[PDB]
Design a protein around this ligand. Structure first.
Ligand code: F43
Ligand code: F43
Ligand SMILES: C[C@@H](OP(=O)(O)O)[C@H](NC(=O)/C=C/CCCCSSCCS(=O)(=O)O)C(=O)O
Ligand SMILES: O=S(=O)(O)CCS
Lengths: 114, 550, 47, 194, 495
């Protein structure tokens, strides 16, 4: 799969890229997913992970397992949007609308990825 | 007039199938095909990322592709269309799994092993012990090591397609065995077919070993028999605990894994040097027995045409276009025999003519019936090509036309007489009549075996004589050229579909490939190829669990 | 379900004849010909 | 949400690039609720299917101990015609360490005939309800065929004082257990514990 | 007090990770199985899918029969064409289907030449540069051996060799070469000169990795049973990146073990568990490295790297000294003995060290195998055990067959292989034989062992498997960080 992380922290970028790769390998999800992009915002605690699958409910369950594995533990408030591109926003605070807008922007960017 | 191929021609061609004129050079080249555009986008991404700028796919060199309308392909008796690129054996996982399932199958009889265990080794053999042995071999065949944690074992998820199954013609033993790993002849076959197969098999017990696909991918086809034998020996000495010496163990080993072994194909000599279980060693009768449409269909034409489709996909595509030539391949020739209902229409006409004139099997094989049936079917097929210009555009190569017409003629003759050599004789007469009709035939060396055929069809000489069931890709006339062997297998099957036979050459192969645990279901090869062409076929042999995700 | 009947275990299909019913711990149990207790809810009558 | 303290083992792991646990060792989770029993510290058992169950239980809020058996590989000596390859066994100290927990979770392999006799020998000395986590589909009656106390299929002549309380199938050795299996194990533990 | 239900703990050593020689990576023993290691599979795939074709007879046909002029620009155009045609693109015959480029991303057609003037005006995209990839002296030696000849290296996709067998590769390359020739020079699609091209590329100028084994063996070409020891020595590329003769011989030993003993013997001619601990014994811990370095130190202290000519006395001296040292090391350190628990492992390691020492003393490979066999029969008397029964078949007839001149028994060790009649069945010999053959030339500082074309062809930087450091790549594959080709995920549904 394609893995890229948008973070201003140098160590966080590489470490979470490795975490994403490992979580994909553990669930055997590498060949079933086209792209996996994660946006890290730690100053205001919230993270966004987008998934563009290749081309059922079991695959979706595996994808939410991947989100649960990758996301930091403290971010327990999560909501997801699924319209052939699964995007989830995780934060320790109730989700704000701007974060959802960023999520849909990531979703549309992932859709046109080719 | 109503023809079975009319609907496909309506779908493929925008103009009337009887219309003699069209226009070209207005489709934009390769851009008219979604597959080619996907290939271009991929090639760009791969070149930039993995190839470090070394070009891979350049449509701008060579022929300007797409000067004409690139037609889509139906699949006979299936209502789904696909591009021609999806039917390439490398782009189609269904064809790859079709070859994988045949390659990784070995049938071993376990009656000498049981007799040696009972008498020489002094160990009792009971259905409970057989169940224990089946458990042991099912754990050990893929990669397992019995009660030895210190031994290296293959990852279990890497061999999810590996099974060990058992079947027997003994009814009481069959119902005393565990149904988890039993191929039940009674519930898989109709009553009369099951009775015939049980009578042919006898009161003997056989085990089928499906080596994992990955083993055949990494290694060759000759690895399968050795893998099966080694695992069978280990499981036999692990399940049954024996206190006899080591020499008695050698006798038991011979009895258990070197006595009643049935392989799919034989080794090939000369420049075709190959091991066993390669597609060039599979006889036509064996391939007819591999296909299981006699189980689920009473139509003789459909039974012959499924074998034709499987034989085309194996012999013409995999064997000839890769094992023997390589490159883009000979997909064209094989798809011509199973894409549209052209061969279906021709074979149905041949069956109707035979039924109206001679009866279903109402004549003994004589020269006159061969000549008249083959001539009538060939003339019908050629005039069908003549009066439907879209049909001639669909089968643009001469070979694909010749093979289809000759296959129809041979199937008709086999229907009339029930003799496979008479059917092949009709095939050859059809070929030369086609040549005189259209002043044309296949490519440069298409009719090497069609000029030599008439004399070799009923010959009795050493290197020329063989029943068509016992012939195959290593038959000297059939060794090289494309567009024959799959149709030969279909004709061999049609020789027995006329008689309503339960099998053609080997009952054990038929029962073994009736197994529901196979990845490729041989009951409907055309449907599975259609599924593979749509990227909806789950093939085995993928090393997903030992590779990085990035 | 009674003594002498024919029952099969739904999970595996083992066939046997009911030998006795031996309640214990305010719970019904069914003994088959293989000298193994079973549960009535996991057993059903066949003919 | 409460603090969870584990008594790490007193001995180190298997070399440099090897596993973190050691054979025949015990790691008490203070408050004794669940003990996860691993047949060996090897890659086939440790951190791929076992530490995953461990962190699933520890996420559910239930303290967990992990015990690696000294001799967990093979079949017991009481198996028909004895054992082969290796001998399975349970030490008295291991049994005492297990028996102070409310429940036990034990991970088994593929062959049914091995699992049944291993469970019988294990429950000959363990008196708490246990959960069998194996790969093969094994029915909750073949254990009773050789004498094991079982919640649904009791034996006439019980040869064990422990009760197989649940059997969970589909967990492969050396492979990451999906969240669905962890959820099933947690639900079984919760409903069979309190 | 005897409790029969206590059990017996077993396999403590096998639980510990296996280091890899000359690396710093620790891996499990289960990850070194050839089925579980994608790096070993890719090693075999890269060797299998390689065919070298001499594109000089074809040029002569184009010049003298078809009257076509061949210039470096035409060769560049031809290379552009074949890099598109070999993976499965269409060049002539309107209306073809094509293979997915995603499945053939590892397919390359490369060109190398010993002619520097022609190599100067050649597109560096398709050029295997001998000057850039090899040191000056090695480059000069390779060019002198190759001569002013042009060769084309075709690497057909790994998927082709995985679906089919190894006999497919030469035919695939030949068809695509003929197609690219007729479409790059605007020739008739089929005439007599086309047959000349086809014959040249099919057998006259083709170089196969492995010969066919017709008859009893029953196997096609480009199978591991047909690869000679010198060919495998030339496949390994440590000679051009390192100057340590022992390191080069040991990398060849590792590659030979992983190919022959694991793949060929434990799968092609056996099955199931295979022979992983028989082969990893030669490249996991530095045991063989320590023994080989002791052998080199002893030889350089009393003989020199080539200070003596191969005689019987030097063979006896070196092989006996190294065998005694290795067995003394096994006695002194129980860790070494419990690491190589099986007698076959120990016998192979000690004999490999002795043969490498003899080769470093004399520079002769047959003297190396003679030393190996002396080491085997001395190990037998030292410990009163050799290996599994059936192991010392070739070791008993070895001494007689090592210097034999009879038809069925004589062959230089570079020309020997798994189809040599004595070597055809038993594990624990062949990879070490390849290492001894390599050490015969590492002593002399040779650029190659048997075939310069194979060495240059496998010096290509675009190969998926890095043959400069085979043990590092094996370790990477064991750690699930090696990317292998031949996978078909673009044509498969999402799981
Ligand atoms: C160059 C050759 C010589 C040869 O050995 N093979 C060729 C070309 C080869 C290449 C095509 C390379 C590419 O895509 O550019 C391959 C794929 C063999 C290979 N593995 O490389 C092939 N043909 Ni041919 N080839 C075919 C056919 C044909 C029919 C085309 C009929 C017609 O319209 O004239 C004719 C034979 C004829 O003499 O009639 C034919 C010829 C020829 N065929 C003549 C001349 C082609 C020309 O147009 O200049 N193929 C067909 O009849 C359909 C099947 C098709 C095969 C691929 C597939 O199945 O998709 C393909 C099979
Ligand atoms: C367990 C057996 C039974 C048998 O028929 N062969 C075995 C087992 C077999 C199986 C193991 C899998 C399994 O499920 O059995 C295979 C893989 C056979 C094969 N296909 O090559 C094997 N041994 Ni064995 N076998 C080995 C070895 C050995 C060494 C072990 C020495 C010791 O004292 O511990 C000895 C041979 C000898 O005595 O010299 C040995 C014996 C034995 N080996 C005897 C011993 C008991 C018997 O009397 O029945 N192996 C070794 O020396 C290391 C390499 C190892 C091979 C697999 C690997 O390379 O990974 C394996 C190779
Ligand atoms: C193909 C086969 O030929 P053959 O069995 O007909 O000689 C040949 N195998 C052998 O020669 C023998 C196979 C046994 C495997 C090696 C034993 S290692 S572990 C067993 C130790 S022992 O107890 O058997 O001595 C091969 O090339 O693998
Ligand atoms: O036309 S040829 O006979 O050369 C080959 C047809 S693909």
């Amino acid at each position: 799969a394609y893995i890229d992380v948008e973070c201003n922290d140098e160590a966080g970028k590489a470490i979470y890229e490795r975490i994403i790769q490992t979580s994909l390998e553990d669930l055997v999800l590498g060949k079933s997913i086209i792209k996996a992009k994660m946006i890290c915002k730690q100053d205001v605690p919230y993270f966004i992970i987008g998934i563009l699958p290749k081309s059922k409910e079991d695959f979706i369950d595996r994808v939410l397992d991947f989100m649960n594995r990758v996301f930091p533990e403290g971010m327990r408030i999560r909501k997801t949007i699924r319209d052939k591109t699964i995007v989830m926003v995780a934060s320790e605070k109730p989700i704000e609308e701007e974060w959802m807008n960023e999520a849909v922007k990531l979703q549309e960017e992932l859709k046109i990825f080719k | 007039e109503k023809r079975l191929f009319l609907k496909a021609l309506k779908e493929k061609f925008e103009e009337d199938p009887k219309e003699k004129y069209t226009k070209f050079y207005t489709f934009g080249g390769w851009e008219q095909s979604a597959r080619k555009r996907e290939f271009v986008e991929a090639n760009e991404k791969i070149v930039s990322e993995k190839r470090q700028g070394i070009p891979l796919y350049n449509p701008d060199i060579g022929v300007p592709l797409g000067q004409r309308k690139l037609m889509p392909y139906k699949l006979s008796n299936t209502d789904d269309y696909c591009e021609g690129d999806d039917l390439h054996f490398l782009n189609n996982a269904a064809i790859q799994q079709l070859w994988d399932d045949i390659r990784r199958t070995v049938i071993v009889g376990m009656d000498t092993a049981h007799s040696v265990l009972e008498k020489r080794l002094g160990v009792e053999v009971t259905p409970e012990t057989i169940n224990e042995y089946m458990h042991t071999i099912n754990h050990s065949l893929p990669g397992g090591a019995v009660v030895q944690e210190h031994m290296v074992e293959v990852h279990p998820s890497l061999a999810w397609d590996c099974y060990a199954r058992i079947f027997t013609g003994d009814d009481e033993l069959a119902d005393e065995l565990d149904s988890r790993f039993l191929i039940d002849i009674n519930k898989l076959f109709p009553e009369e077919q099951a009775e015939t197969l049980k009578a042919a098999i006898g009161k003997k017990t056989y085990q089928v070993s499906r080596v994992p696909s990955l083993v055949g991918r990494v290694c060759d086809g000759g690895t399968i028999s050795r893998w099966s034998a080694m695992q069978i020996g280990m499981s036999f000495i692990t399940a049954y605990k024996l206190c006899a010496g080591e020499a008695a163990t050698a006798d038991f080993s011979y009895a258990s894994k070197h006595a009643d072994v049935i392989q799919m194909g034989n080794a090939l000599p000369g420049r075709r040097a190959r091991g066993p279980n390669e597609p060039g060693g599979i006889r036509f009768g064996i391939l007819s027995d591999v296909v299981q449409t006699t189980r689920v269909s009473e139509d003789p034409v459909e039974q012959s045409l499924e074998v034709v489709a499987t034989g085309a996909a194996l012999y013409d595509q995999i064997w000839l276009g890769a094992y023997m030539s390589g490159g883009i391949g000979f997909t064209q020739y094989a798809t011509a025999s199973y894409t549209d209902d052209i061969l279906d229409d021709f074979s149905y006409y041949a069956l109707d003519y035979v039924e109206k004139k001679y009866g279903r099997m109402g004549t003994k094989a004589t020269m006159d019936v061969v000549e008249d049936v083959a001539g009538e079917v060939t003339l019908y097929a050629l005039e069908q090509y003549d009066d439907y210009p879209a049909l001639l555009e669909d089968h643009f190569g001469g070979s694909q036309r010749a093979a289809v017409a000759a296959a129809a003629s041979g199937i008709g003759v086999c229907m009339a007489t029930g003799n496979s050599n008479a059917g092949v004789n009709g095939w050859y007469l059809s070929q030369i009549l086609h040549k005189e009709y259209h002043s044309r035939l296949g490519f440069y060396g298409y009719d090497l075996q069609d000029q030599c055929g008439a004399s070799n069809s009923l010959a009795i000489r050493n290197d020329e004589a063989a029943p068509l069931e016992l012939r195959g890709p290593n038959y000297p006339n059939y060794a090289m050229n494309v567009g024959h062997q799959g149709e030969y297998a279909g004709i061999a099957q049609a020789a027995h579909s006329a008689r309503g036979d339960a099998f053609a050459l080997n009952p054990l192969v038929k029962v073994a490939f009736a197994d529901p645990m196979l990845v490729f279901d041989f009951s409907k090869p055309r449907k599975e190829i259609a599924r593979g062409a749509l990227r909806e076929f789950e093939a085995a042999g993928e090393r997903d669990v030992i590779l990085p995700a990035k | 379900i009674e003594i002498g009947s024919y029952v099969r275990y739904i999970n595996t299909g083992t066939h046997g004849t009911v030998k006795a019913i031996e309640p214990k711990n305010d719970e019904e149990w069914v003994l088959l010909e293989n000298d193994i207790y079973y549960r009535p809810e996991l057993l059903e009558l066949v003919e | 949400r409460k603090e969870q303290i584990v008594d790490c083992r007193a001995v180190m792991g298997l070399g440099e690039g090897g596993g973190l646990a050691q054979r025949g060792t015990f790691a008490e989770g203070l408050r004794n609720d669940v003990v996860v029993v691993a047949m060996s510290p090897g890659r086939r058992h440790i951190t791929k299917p076992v530490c995953e169950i461990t962190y699933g239980i520890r996420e559910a809020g239930i303290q967990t101990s992990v015990l690696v058996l000294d001799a967990g590989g093979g079949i017991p000596s009481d198996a028909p015609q004895g054992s082969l390859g290796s001998t399975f066994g349970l030490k008295p100290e291991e049994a005492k360490q297990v028996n102070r927990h409310k429940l036990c979770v034990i991970h088994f392999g593929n062959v049914k005939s091995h699992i049944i006799y291993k469970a019988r020998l294990f429950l000959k000395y363990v008196d708490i309800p246990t959960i069998i986590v194996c790969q093969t589909p094994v029915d909750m009656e073949d254990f009773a065929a050789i004498g094991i106390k079982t919640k649904n299929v009791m034996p006439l002549e019980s040869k064990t004082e422990g009760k197989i309380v649940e059997i969970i199938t589909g967990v492969i050795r050396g492979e990451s257990a999906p969240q669905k299996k962890i959820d099933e194990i947690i639900e079984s533990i919760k409903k069979h514990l309190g």
